[PDB]
Amino acid sequence: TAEVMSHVTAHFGKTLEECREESGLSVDILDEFKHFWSDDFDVVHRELGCAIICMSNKFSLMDDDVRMHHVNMDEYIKSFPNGQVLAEKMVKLIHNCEKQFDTETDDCTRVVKVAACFKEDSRKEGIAPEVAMVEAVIEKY
Ligand SMILES: [Mg+2]
Ligand SMILES: [Mg+2]
Ligand SMILES: [Mg+2]
């Protein structure tokens, strides 16, 4: 659901600043991770793919194939209030997106394409949070 997605995003997004330098992710491309969810933000830069790899590896959310670690993701989403309602759905969505971009050779590009797909499908499924909702939870934890 949208509130669980907001907590996941608020928390995961804390690692964006430490990942900017090594990814090339200028604040002019993405200032706050919460904006990932705005209708007015296109999820397309290779640099954001590179940032997402960086951020994910902080929390061991990707495996050695630079794909989602399913068990670690499920455990992560379960760590938030009401997380069990999103965990299986979110892993499914991410994995179903991964399979669409398995032929992309560039890991950074592959992950940003997976990310745009996940945002799309999340909007479609009605679990995509508003930027306001992510912001409302930024203080936690
Ligand atoms: Mg770099
Ligand atoms: Mg470029
Ligand atoms: Mg690792």
Side-chain angles (χ1 to χ4, degrees), residues 1-16 30 32-38 55 59 61 73 76-77 79-80 86 90 118-119 122 127-141:
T1 63
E3 194 169 55
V4 178
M5 190 68 66
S6 67
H7 278 70
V8 180
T9 295
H11 184 257
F12 184 75
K14 292 165 130 170
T15 62
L16 176 59
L30 191 57
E32 301 279 1
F33 199 70
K34 64 190 180 196
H35 190 64
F36 174 90
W37 288 112
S38 90
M55 293 162 77
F59 297 113
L61 297 178
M73 180 75 68
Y76 185 68
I77 302 164
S79 78
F80 303 86
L86 176 63
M90 178 163 176
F118 168 70
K119 174 175 163 182
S122 286
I127 55 166
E130 302 303 314
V131 178
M133 303 170 50
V134 188
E135 185 185 308
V137 165
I138 301 171
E139 309 176 72
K140 303 197 176 182
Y141 321 135

mmCIF file of all heavy atoms in Angstrom, residues 1-16 30 32-38 55 59 61 73 76-77 79-80 86 90 118-119 122 127-141:
data_model
loop_
_atom_site.group_PDB
_atom_site.id
_atom_site.type_symbol
_atom_site.label_atom_id
_atom_site.label_comp_id
_atom_site.label_asym_id
_atom_site.label_seq_id
_atom_site.Cartn_x
_atom_site.Cartn_y
_atom_site.Cartn_z
ATOM 1 N N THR A 1 0.799 -1.233 0.000
ATOM 2 C CA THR A 1 0.000 0.000 0.000
ATOM 3 C C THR A 1 0.826 1.275 0.000
ATOM 4 O O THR A 1 2.046 1.270 0.227
ATOM 5 C CB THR A 1 -0.891 0.056 1.201
ATOM 6 O OG1 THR A 1 -0.077 0.093 2.379
ATOM 7 C CG2 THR A 1 -1.840 -1.164 1.218
ATOM 8 N N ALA A 2 0.133 2.390 -0.218
ATOM 9 C CA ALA A 2 0.844 3.643 -0.457
ATOM 10 C C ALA A 2 1.622 4.145 0.784
ATOM 11 O O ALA A 2 2.678 4.776 0.662
ATOM 12 C CB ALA A 2 -0.110 4.705 -0.983
ATOM 13 N N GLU A 3 1.056 3.952 1.971
ATOM 14 C CA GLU A 3 1.761 4.363 3.207
ATOM 15 C C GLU A 3 2.967 3.504 3.493
ATOM 16 O O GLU A 3 4.009 4.013 3.874
ATOM 17 C CB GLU A 3 0.823 4.354 4.382
ATOM 18 C CG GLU A 3 1.392 5.068 5.545
ATOM 19 C CD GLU A 3 0.370 5.312 6.648
ATOM 20 O OE1 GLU A 3 -0.244 4.343 7.111
ATOM 21 O OE2 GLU A 3 0.260 6.475 7.097
ATOM 22 N N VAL A 4 2.854 2.186 3.309
ATOM 23 C CA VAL A 4 4.046 1.361 3.517
ATOM 24 C C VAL A 4 5.083 1.839 2.473
ATOM 25 O O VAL A 4 6.268 1.991 2.819
ATOM 26 C CB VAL A 4 3.715 -0.126 3.285
ATOM 27 C CG1 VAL A 4 4.911 -0.949 3.446
ATOM 28 C CG2 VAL A 4 2.607 -0.495 4.267
ATOM 29 N N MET A 5 4.648 2.051 1.205
ATOM 30 C CA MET A 5 5.615 2.447 0.159
ATOM 31 C C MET A 5 6.279 3.750 0.605
ATOM 32 O O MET A 5 7.432 3.960 0.324
ATOM 33 C CB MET A 5 4.902 2.650 -1.192
ATOM 34 C CG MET A 5 5.917 2.813 -2.336
ATOM 35 S SD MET A 5 6.878 1.297 -2.726
ATOM 36 C CE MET A 5 5.544 0.276 -3.346
ATOM 37 N N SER A 6 5.534 4.631 1.287
ATOM 38 C CA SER A 6 6.145 5.907 1.729
ATOM 39 C C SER A 6 7.245 5.690 2.763
ATOM 40 O O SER A 6 8.289 6.397 2.732
ATOM 41 C CB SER A 6 5.107 6.949 2.173
ATOM 42 O OG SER A 6 4.430 6.570 3.339
ATOM 43 N N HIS A 7 7.103 4.678 3.638
ATOM 44 C CA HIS A 7 8.083 4.460 4.681
ATOM 45 C C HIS A 7 9.310 3.840 4.016
ATOM 46 O O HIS A 7 10.429 4.212 4.266
ATOM 47 C CB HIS A 7 7.516 3.474 5.736
ATOM 48 C CG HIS A 7 6.637 4.152 6.720
ATOM 49 N ND1 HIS A 7 5.398 4.640 6.372
ATOM 50 C CD2 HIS A 7 6.840 4.518 8.004
ATOM 51 C CE1 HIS A 7 4.835 5.196 7.426
ATOM 52 N NE2 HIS A 7 5.697 5.156 8.420
ATOM 53 N N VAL A 8 9.078 2.849 3.178
ATOM 54 C CA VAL A 8 10.203 2.248 2.466
ATOM 55 C C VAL A 8 11.029 3.334 1.743
ATOM 56 O O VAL A 8 12.238 3.365 1.830
ATOM 57 C CB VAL A 8 9.714 1.183 1.456
ATOM 58 C CG1 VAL A 8 10.872 0.626 0.791
ATOM 59 C CG2 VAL A 8 9.023 0.001 2.186
ATOM 60 N N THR A 9 10.342 4.236 1.048
ATOM 61 C CA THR A 9 11.012 5.268 0.249
ATOM 62 C C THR A 9 11.745 6.244 1.166
ATOM 63 O O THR A 9 12.920 6.605 0.845
ATOM 64 C CB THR A 9 9.956 6.072 -0.584
ATOM 65 O OG1 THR A 9 9.334 5.201 -1.529
ATOM 66 C CG2 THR A 9 10.689 7.159 -1.396
ATOM 67 N N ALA A 10 11.063 6.729 2.225
ATOM 68 C CA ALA A 10 11.684 7.693 3.196
ATOM 69 C C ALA A 10 12.945 7.128 3.796
ATOM 70 O O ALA A 10 13.971 7.839 3.950
ATOM 71 C CB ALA A 10 10.683 8.059 4.313
ATOM 72 N N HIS A 11 12.947 5.836 4.083
ATOM 73 C CA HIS A 11 14.068 5.269 4.746
ATOM 74 C C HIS A 11 15.237 4.960 3.793
ATOM 75 O O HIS A 11 16.405 5.285 4.083
ATOM 76 C CB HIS A 11 13.642 3.981 5.470
ATOM 77 C CG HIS A 11 14.767 3.417 6.245
ATOM 78 N ND1 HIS A 11 15.504 2.330 5.827
ATOM 79 C CD2 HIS A 11 15.369 3.879 7.366
ATOM 80 C CE1 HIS A 11 16.476 2.100 6.684
ATOM 81 N NE2 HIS A 11 16.420 3.026 7.633
ATOM 82 N N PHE A 12 14.903 4.337 2.660
ATOM 83 C CA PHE A 12 15.861 3.997 1.611
ATOM 84 C C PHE A 12 16.530 5.272 1.079
ATOM 85 O O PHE A 12 17.749 5.311 0.858
ATOM 86 C CB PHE A 12 15.086 3.325 0.483
ATOM 87 C CG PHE A 12 15.966 2.817 -0.688
ATOM 88 C CD1 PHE A 12 16.743 1.677 -0.574
ATOM 89 C CD2 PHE A 12 16.019 3.537 -1.879
ATOM 90 C CE1 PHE A 12 17.484 1.242 -1.675
ATOM 91 C CE2 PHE A 12 16.750 3.112 -2.947
ATOM 92 C CZ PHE A 12 17.499 1.955 -2.857
ATOM 93 N N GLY A 13 15.702 6.283 0.874
ATOM 94 C CA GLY A 13 16.189 7.578 0.415
ATOM 95 C C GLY A 13 17.233 8.298 1.237
ATOM 96 O O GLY A 13 17.919 9.201 0.700
ATOM 97 N N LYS A 14 17.396 7.902 2.498
ATOM 98 C CA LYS A 14 18.438 8.527 3.357
ATOM 99 C C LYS A 14 19.860 8.274 2.794
ATOM 100 O O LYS A 14 20.731 9.167 2.875
ATOM 101 C CB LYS A 14 18.302 7.981 4.774
ATOM 102 C CG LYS A 14 17.042 8.393 5.535
ATOM 103 C CD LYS A 14 16.872 7.469 6.761
ATOM 104 C CE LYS A 14 16.636 8.296 8.019
ATOM 105 N NZ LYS A 14 16.223 7.439 9.213
ATOM 106 N N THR A 15 20.088 7.155 2.123
ATOM 107 C CA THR A 15 21.384 6.834 1.551
ATOM 108 C C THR A 15 21.689 7.569 0.205
ATOM 109 O O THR A 15 22.771 7.416 -0.380
ATOM 110 C CB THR A 15 21.594 5.340 1.334
ATOM 111 O OG1 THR A 15 20.598 4.937 0.405
ATOM 112 C CG2 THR A 15 21.341 4.584 2.629
ATOM 113 N N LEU A 16 20.777 8.397 -0.269
ATOM 114 C CA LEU A 16 21.046 9.081 -1.513
ATOM 115 C C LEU A 16 22.265 10.003 -1.396
ATOM 116 O O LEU A 16 23.107 9.987 -2.300
ATOM 117 C CB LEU A 16 19.863 9.903 -1.955
ATOM 118 C CG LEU A 16 20.099 10.722 -3.217
ATOM 119 C CD1 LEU A 16 20.471 9.805 -4.424
ATOM 120 C CD2 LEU A 16 18.885 11.588 -3.495
ATOM 121 N N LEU A 30 18.286 14.999 -9.288
ATOM 122 C CA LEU A 30 17.404 14.589 -8.150
ATOM 123 C C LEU A 30 17.877 15.169 -6.815
ATOM 124 O O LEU A 30 18.958 14.802 -6.310
ATOM 125 C CB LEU A 30 17.271 13.041 -8.055
ATOM 126 C CG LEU A 30 16.193 12.462 -7.095
ATOM 127 C CD1 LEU A 30 14.747 13.029 -7.472
ATOM 128 C CD2 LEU A 30 16.252 10.954 -7.143
ATOM 129 N N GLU A 32 15.849 15.399 -3.724
ATOM 130 C CA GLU A 32 15.469 14.576 -2.602
ATOM 131 C C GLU A 32 14.921 13.300 -3.232
ATOM 132 O O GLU A 32 14.169 13.367 -4.236
ATOM 133 C CB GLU A 32 14.351 15.280 -1.810
ATOM 134 C CG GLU A 32 14.700 16.712 -1.246
ATOM 135 C CD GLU A 32 15.495 16.645 0.042
ATOM 136 O OE1 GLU A 32 15.806 15.518 0.497
ATOM 137 O OE2 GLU A 32 15.848 17.744 0.567
ATOM 138 N N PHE A 33 15.257 12.168 -2.636
ATOM 139 C CA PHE A 33 14.759 10.862 -3.191
ATOM 140 C C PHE A 33 13.252 10.808 -3.291
ATOM 141 O O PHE A 33 12.715 10.184 -4.220
ATOM 142 C CB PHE A 33 15.262 9.618 -2.424
ATOM 143 C CG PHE A 33 15.151 8.353 -3.194
ATOM 144 C CD1 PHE A 33 15.980 8.129 -4.296
ATOM 145 C CD2 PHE A 33 14.241 7.394 -2.823
ATOM 146 C CE1 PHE A 33 15.831 6.955 -5.006
ATOM 147 C CE2 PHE A 33 14.089 6.206 -3.581
ATOM 148 C CZ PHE A 33 14.911 6.004 -4.613
ATOM 149 N N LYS A 34 12.535 11.418 -2.349
ATOM 150 C CA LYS A 34 11.065 11.436 -2.417
ATOM 151 C C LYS A 34 10.481 11.851 -3.751
ATOM 152 O O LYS A 34 9.475 11.308 -4.177
ATOM 153 C CB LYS A 34 10.441 12.265 -1.285
ATOM 154 C CG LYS A 34 10.800 13.706 -1.371
ATOM 155 C CD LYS A 34 10.399 14.446 -0.137
ATOM 156 C CE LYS A 34 10.845 15.893 -0.389
ATOM 157 N NZ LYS A 34 10.877 16.667 0.883
ATOM 158 N N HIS A 35 11.159 12.760 -4.439
ATOM 159 C CA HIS A 35 10.702 13.267 -5.751
ATOM 160 C C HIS A 35 10.642 12.148 -6.827
ATOM 161 O O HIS A 35 9.990 12.326 -7.836
ATOM 162 C CB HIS A 35 11.605 14.429 -6.200
ATOM 163 C CG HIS A 35 11.106 15.195 -7.394
ATOM 164 N ND1 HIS A 35 9.932 15.931 -7.398
ATOM 165 C CD2 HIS A 35 11.659 15.354 -8.631
ATOM 166 C CE1 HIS A 35 9.748 16.467 -8.599
ATOM 167 N NE2 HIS A 35 10.792 16.148 -9.361
ATOM 168 N N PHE A 36 11.348 11.018 -6.592
ATOM 169 C CA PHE A 36 11.219 9.860 -7.475
ATOM 170 C C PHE A 36 9.728 9.600 -7.837
ATOM 171 O O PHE A 36 9.442 9.188 -8.943
ATOM 172 C CB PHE A 36 11.782 8.644 -6.771
ATOM 173 C CG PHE A 36 11.571 7.363 -7.533
ATOM 174 C CD1 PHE A 36 12.519 6.936 -8.438
ATOM 175 C CD2 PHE A 36 10.448 6.582 -7.310
ATOM 176 C CE1 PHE A 36 12.391 5.686 -9.117
ATOM 177 C CE2 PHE A 36 10.281 5.362 -8.019
ATOM 178 C CZ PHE A 36 11.277 4.925 -8.923
ATOM 179 N N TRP A 37 8.821 9.840 -6.908
ATOM 180 C CA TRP A 37 7.442 9.563 -7.080
ATOM 181 C C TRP A 37 6.584 10.657 -7.682
ATOM 182 O O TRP A 37 5.413 10.433 -7.939
ATOM 183 C CB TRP A 37 6.837 9.184 -5.749
ATOM 184 C CG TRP A 37 7.248 7.833 -5.230
ATOM 185 C CD1 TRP A 37 8.004 7.603 -4.162
ATOM 186 C CD2 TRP A 37 6.939 6.556 -5.824
ATOM 187 N NE1 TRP A 37 8.198 6.244 -3.981
ATOM 188 C CE2 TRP A 37 7.557 5.577 -5.009
ATOM 189 C CE3 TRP A 37 6.131 6.143 -6.926
ATOM 190 C CZ2 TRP A 37 7.424 4.206 -5.235
ATOM 191 C CZ3 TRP A 37 6.034 4.774 -7.154
ATOM 192 C CH2 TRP A 37 6.679 3.820 -6.308
ATOM 193 N N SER A 38 7.152 11.825 -7.954
ATOM 194 C CA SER A 38 6.317 12.911 -8.483
ATOM 195 C C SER A 38 6.003 12.602 -9.936
ATOM 196 O O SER A 38 6.842 12.028 -10.646
ATOM 197 C CB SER A 38 7.019 14.252 -8.404
ATOM 198 O OG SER A 38 7.759 14.479 -9.585
ATOM 199 N N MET A 55 22.716 2.614 -3.327
ATOM 200 C CA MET A 55 21.813 2.698 -2.190
ATOM 201 C C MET A 55 21.421 1.316 -1.800
ATOM 202 O O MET A 55 21.449 0.951 -0.628
ATOM 203 C CB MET A 55 20.597 3.565 -2.549
ATOM 204 C CG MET A 55 20.973 5.051 -2.773
ATOM 205 S SD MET A 55 19.766 5.959 -3.657
ATOM 206 C CE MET A 55 18.583 6.207 -2.400
ATOM 207 N N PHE A 59 22.070 -1.664 2.003
ATOM 208 C CA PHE A 59 21.086 -2.445 2.738
ATOM 209 C C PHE A 59 21.088 -3.911 2.239
ATOM 210 O O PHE A 59 20.148 -4.690 2.534
ATOM 211 C CB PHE A 59 19.705 -1.836 2.497
ATOM 212 C CG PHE A 59 19.550 -0.417 2.999
ATOM 213 C CD1 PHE A 59 19.372 0.643 2.108
ATOM 214 C CD2 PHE A 59 19.534 -0.157 4.375
ATOM 215 C CE1 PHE A 59 19.242 1.945 2.572
ATOM 216 C CE2 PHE A 59 19.395 1.160 4.866
ATOM 217 C CZ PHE A 59 19.258 2.214 3.944
ATOM 218 N N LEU A 61 20.253 -5.058 -0.623
ATOM 219 C CA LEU A 61 18.980 -5.292 -1.248
ATOM 220 C C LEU A 61 19.141 -5.860 -2.646
ATOM 221 O O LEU A 61 18.177 -6.270 -3.272
ATOM 222 C CB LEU A 61 18.082 -4.041 -1.241
ATOM 223 C CG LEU A 61 17.683 -3.555 0.152
ATOM 224 C CD1 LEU A 61 16.867 -2.297 -0.143
ATOM 225 C CD2 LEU A 61 16.933 -4.541 0.913
ATOM 226 N N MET A 73 14.914 -8.158 0.356
ATOM 227 C CA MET A 73 13.885 -7.202 0.103
ATOM 228 C C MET A 73 12.615 -7.498 0.940
ATOM 229 O O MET A 73 12.025 -6.581 1.503
ATOM 230 C CB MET A 73 13.618 -7.077 -1.387
ATOM 231 C CG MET A 73 12.570 -6.118 -1.735
ATOM 232 S SD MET A 73 13.219 -4.427 -1.543
ATOM 233 C CE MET A 73 14.393 -4.411 -2.859
ATOM 234 N N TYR A 76 13.210 -6.503 4.333
ATOM 235 C CA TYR A 76 13.218 -5.034 4.448
ATOM 236 C C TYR A 76 11.833 -4.435 4.473
ATOM 237 O O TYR A 76 11.491 -3.603 5.323
ATOM 238 C CB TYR A 76 14.085 -4.435 3.344
ATOM 239 C CG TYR A 76 14.276 -2.942 3.397
ATOM 240 C CD1 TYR A 76 15.006 -2.360 4.408
ATOM 241 C CD2 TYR A 76 13.782 -2.138 2.377
ATOM 242 C CE1 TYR A 76 15.217 -0.994 4.435
ATOM 243 C CE2 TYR A 76 14.032 -0.771 2.370
ATOM 244 C CZ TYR A 76 14.718 -0.218 3.388
ATOM 245 O OH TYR A 76 14.934 1.161 3.332
ATOM 246 N N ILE A 77 11.001 -4.867 3.579
ATOM 247 C CA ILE A 77 9.676 -4.302 3.536
ATOM 248 C C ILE A 77 8.898 -4.703 4.772
ATOM 249 O O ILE A 77 8.214 -3.868 5.336
ATOM 250 C CB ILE A 77 8.946 -4.783 2.244
ATOM 251 C CG1 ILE A 77 9.769 -4.382 0.965
ATOM 252 C CG2 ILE A 77 7.467 -4.304 2.242
ATOM 253 C CD1 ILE A 77 9.342 -5.109 -0.250
ATOM 254 N N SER A 79 9.945 -4.847 7.652
ATOM 255 C CA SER A 79 10.508 -4.133 8.784
ATOM 256 C C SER A 79 9.757 -2.880 9.012
ATOM 257 O O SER A 79 10.041 -2.251 9.998
ATOM 258 C CB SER A 79 12.015 -3.853 8.577
ATOM 259 O OG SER A 79 12.294 -2.759 7.694
ATOM 260 N N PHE A 80 8.864 -2.492 8.082
ATOM 261 C CA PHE A 80 8.024 -1.289 8.260
ATOM 262 C C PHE A 80 6.621 -1.629 8.755
ATOM 263 O O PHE A 80 6.160 -2.778 8.616
ATOM 264 C CB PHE A 80 8.027 -0.455 6.986
ATOM 265 C CG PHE A 80 9.396 -0.048 6.574
ATOM 266 C CD1 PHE A 80 10.244 -0.820 5.793
ATOM 267 C CD2 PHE A 80 9.901 1.158 7.069
ATOM 268 C CE1 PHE A 80 11.547 -0.412 5.458
ATOM 269 C CE2 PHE A 80 11.194 1.538 6.739
ATOM 270 C CZ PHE A 80 12.045 0.722 5.965
ATOM 271 N N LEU A 86 2.593 -5.315 1.690
ATOM 272 C CA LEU A 86 3.264 -4.883 0.467
ATOM 273 C C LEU A 86 4.355 -5.864 0.027
ATOM 274 O O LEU A 86 4.696 -5.923 -1.149
ATOM 275 C CB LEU A 86 3.867 -3.473 0.678
ATOM 276 C CG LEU A 86 4.688 -2.924 -0.486
ATOM 277 C CD1 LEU A 86 3.725 -2.775 -1.700
ATOM 278 C CD2 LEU A 86 5.213 -1.536 -0.086
ATOM 279 N N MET A 90 5.352 -6.140 -3.807
ATOM 280 C CA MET A 90 6.475 -5.357 -4.266
ATOM 281 C C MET A 90 7.618 -6.177 -4.854
ATOM 282 O O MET A 90 8.128 -5.807 -5.904
ATOM 283 C CB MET A 90 6.945 -4.365 -3.173
ATOM 284 C CG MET A 90 8.105 -3.577 -3.575
ATOM 285 S SD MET A 90 8.191 -2.204 -2.449
ATOM 286 C CE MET A 90 9.682 -1.362 -2.919
ATOM 287 N N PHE A 118 8.807 -0.036 -12.416
ATOM 288 C CA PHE A 118 8.274 -0.337 -11.090
ATOM 289 C C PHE A 118 7.380 0.851 -10.698
ATOM 290 O O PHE A 118 6.302 0.686 -10.119
ATOM 291 C CB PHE A 118 9.361 -0.478 -10.049
ATOM 292 C CG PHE A 118 8.867 -0.500 -8.665
ATOM 293 C CD1 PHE A 118 8.134 -1.616 -8.196
ATOM 294 C CD2 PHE A 118 9.178 0.508 -7.788
ATOM 295 C CE1 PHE A 118 7.656 -1.695 -6.901
ATOM 296 C CE2 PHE A 118 8.718 0.435 -6.430
ATOM 297 C CZ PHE A 118 7.941 -0.694 -6.027
ATOM 298 N N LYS A 119 7.849 2.071 -10.992
ATOM 299 C CA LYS A 119 7.047 3.245 -10.718
ATOM 300 C C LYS A 119 5.739 3.232 -11.487
ATOM 301 O O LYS A 119 4.700 3.480 -10.891
ATOM 302 C CB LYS A 119 7.869 4.557 -10.990
ATOM 303 C CG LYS A 119 7.069 5.834 -10.866
ATOM 304 C CD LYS A 119 7.919 7.049 -11.019
ATOM 305 C CE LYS A 119 7.061 8.306 -11.308
ATOM 306 N NZ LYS A 119 8.037 9.462 -11.481
ATOM 307 N N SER A 122 3.503 0.456 -10.154
ATOM 308 C CA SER A 122 3.050 0.801 -8.833
ATOM 309 C C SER A 122 1.911 1.797 -8.937
ATOM 310 O O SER A 122 0.928 1.692 -8.160
ATOM 311 C CB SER A 122 4.216 1.402 -7.983
ATOM 312 O OG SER A 122 5.118 0.440 -7.575
ATOM 313 N N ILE A 127 -0.415 1.755 -5.499
ATOM 314 C CA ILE A 127 0.400 1.726 -4.288
ATOM 315 C C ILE A 127 1.506 2.792 -4.373
ATOM 316 O O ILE A 127 2.425 2.821 -3.554
ATOM 317 C CB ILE A 127 0.992 0.332 -4.073
ATOM 318 C CG1 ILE A 127 1.769 -0.091 -5.332
ATOM 319 C CG2 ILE A 127 -0.104 -0.694 -3.815
ATOM 320 C CD1 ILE A 127 2.648 -1.291 -5.081
ATOM 321 N N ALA A 128 1.399 3.650 -5.367
ATOM 322 C CA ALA A 128 2.450 4.687 -5.538
ATOM 323 C C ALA A 128 2.128 5.850 -4.613
ATOM 324 O O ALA A 128 1.044 6.437 -4.745
ATOM 325 C CB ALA A 128 2.477 5.180 -6.924
ATOM 326 N N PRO A 129 3.062 6.227 -3.704
ATOM 327 C CA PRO A 129 2.737 7.291 -2.745
ATOM 328 C C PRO A 129 2.937 8.650 -3.342
ATOM 329 O O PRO A 129 3.601 8.770 -4.391
ATOM 330 C CB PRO A 129 3.745 7.044 -1.647
ATOM 331 C CG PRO A 129 4.922 6.504 -2.337
ATOM 332 C CD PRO A 129 4.348 5.603 -3.396
ATOM 333 N N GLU A 130 2.291 9.648 -2.738
ATOM 334 C CA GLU A 130 2.515 11.030 -3.090
ATOM 335 C C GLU A 130 3.806 11.471 -2.454
ATOM 336 O O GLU A 130 4.194 10.975 -1.405
ATOM 337 C CB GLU A 130 1.351 11.903 -2.582
ATOM 338 C CG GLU A 130 -0.041 11.531 -3.085
ATOM 339 C CD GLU A 130 -0.191 11.517 -4.605
ATOM 340 O OE1 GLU A 130 0.256 12.457 -5.269
ATOM 341 O OE2 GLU A 130 -0.735 10.520 -5.136
ATOM 342 N N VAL A 131 4.500 12.416 -3.092
ATOM 343 C CA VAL A 131 5.655 13.030 -2.485
ATOM 344 C C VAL A 131 5.363 13.516 -1.072
ATOM 345 O O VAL A 131 6.190 13.234 -0.184
ATOM 346 C CB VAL A 131 6.246 14.145 -3.345
ATOM 347 C CG1 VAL A 131 7.375 14.757 -2.653
ATOM 348 C CG2 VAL A 131 6.759 13.596 -4.682
ATOM 349 N N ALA A 132 4.191 14.151 -0.883
ATOM 350 C CA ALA A 132 3.743 14.667 0.449
ATOM 351 C C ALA A 132 3.793 13.555 1.490
ATOM 352 O O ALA A 132 4.287 13.763 2.628
ATOM 353 C CB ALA A 132 2.361 15.288 0.391
ATOM 354 N N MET A 133 3.362 12.359 1.078
ATOM 355 C CA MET A 133 3.281 11.217 2.037
ATOM 356 C C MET A 133 4.654 10.719 2.457
ATOM 357 O O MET A 133 4.881 10.334 3.653
ATOM 358 C CB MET A 133 2.475 10.053 1.433
ATOM 359 C CG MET A 133 1.077 10.425 1.004
ATOM 360 S SD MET A 133 0.422 9.033 0.084
ATOM 361 C CE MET A 133 0.810 7.721 1.247
ATOM 362 N N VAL A 134 5.608 10.740 1.530
ATOM 363 C CA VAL A 134 6.979 10.379 1.859
ATOM 364 C C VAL A 134 7.550 11.418 2.804
ATOM 365 O O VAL A 134 8.272 11.072 3.775
ATOM 366 C CB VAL A 134 7.932 10.257 0.615
ATOM 367 C CG1 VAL A 134 9.320 9.686 1.025
ATOM 368 C CG2 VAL A 134 7.318 9.353 -0.457
ATOM 369 N N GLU A 135 7.254 12.689 2.505
ATOM 370 C CA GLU A 135 7.825 13.753 3.307
ATOM 371 C C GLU A 135 7.313 13.658 4.729
ATOM 372 O O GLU A 135 8.095 13.896 5.688
ATOM 373 C CB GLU A 135 7.561 15.132 2.669
ATOM 374 C CG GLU A 135 8.200 16.349 3.323
ATOM 375 C CD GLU A 135 7.717 17.635 2.627
ATOM 376 O OE1 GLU A 135 7.792 17.751 1.365
ATOM 377 O OE2 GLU A 135 7.226 18.537 3.363
ATOM 378 N N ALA A 136 6.049 13.266 4.896
ATOM 379 C CA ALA A 136 5.396 13.209 6.208
ATOM 380 C C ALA A 136 6.083 12.205 7.157
ATOM 381 O O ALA A 136 5.958 12.338 8.370
ATOM 382 C CB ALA A 136 3.943 12.889 6.055
ATOM 383 N N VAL A 137 6.798 11.238 6.570
ATOM 384 C CA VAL A 137 7.486 10.159 7.288
ATOM 385 C C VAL A 137 9.007 10.286 7.287
ATOM 386 O O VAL A 137 9.703 9.408 7.820
ATOM 387 C CB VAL A 137 7.184 8.789 6.662
ATOM 388 C CG1 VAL A 137 8.180 7.774 7.175
ATOM 389 C CG2 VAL A 137 5.818 8.380 6.981
ATOM 390 N N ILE A 138 9.541 11.358 6.705
ATOM 391 C CA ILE A 138 11.041 11.488 6.605
ATOM 392 C C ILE A 138 11.836 11.414 7.952
ATOM 393 O O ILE A 138 12.957 10.879 8.009
ATOM 394 C CB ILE A 138 11.521 12.673 5.748
ATOM 395 C CG1 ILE A 138 10.995 12.562 4.333
ATOM 396 C CG2 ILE A 138 13.087 12.631 5.538
ATOM 397 C CD1 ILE A 138 11.289 13.860 3.553
ATOM 398 N N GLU A 139 11.226 11.937 9.009
ATOM 399 C CA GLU A 139 11.812 11.969 10.374
ATOM 400 C C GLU A 139 12.006 10.621 11.074
ATOM 401 O O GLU A 139 12.783 10.497 12.022
ATOM 402 C CB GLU A 139 10.931 12.832 11.305
ATOM 403 C CG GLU A 139 10.585 14.231 10.754
ATOM 404 C CD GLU A 139 9.634 15.035 11.665
ATOM 405 O OE1 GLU A 139 10.073 15.506 12.769
ATOM 406 O OE2 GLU A 139 8.446 15.203 11.263
ATOM 407 N N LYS A 140 11.290 9.594 10.624
ATOM 408 C CA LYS A 140 11.277 8.362 11.388
ATOM 409 C C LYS A 140 12.581 7.621 11.265
ATOM 410 O O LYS A 140 13.159 7.575 10.147
ATOM 411 C CB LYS A 140 10.145 7.444 10.881
ATOM 412 C CG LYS A 140 8.790 8.115 10.943
ATOM 413 C CD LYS A 140 7.682 7.051 10.835
ATOM 414 C CE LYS A 140 6.298 7.702 10.986
ATOM 415 N NZ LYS A 140 5.179 6.670 10.945
ATOM 416 N N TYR A 141 12.988 6.983 12.374
ATOM 417 C CA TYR A 141 14.024 5.929 12.359
ATOM 418 C C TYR A 141 15.417 6.547 12.157
ATOM 419 O O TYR A 141 15.800 7.382 12.989
ATOM 420 C CB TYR A 141 13.725 4.782 11.362
ATOM 421 C CG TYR A 141 12.245 4.366 11.297
ATOM 422 C CD1 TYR A 141 11.610 4.148 10.054
ATOM 423 C CD2 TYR A 141 11.473 4.192 12.484
ATOM 424 C CE1 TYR A 141 10.272 3.761 9.987
ATOM 425 C CE2 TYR A 141 10.135 3.802 12.407
ATOM 426 C CZ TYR A 141 9.559 3.574 11.154
ATOM 427 O OH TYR A 141 8.246 3.209 11.006
#
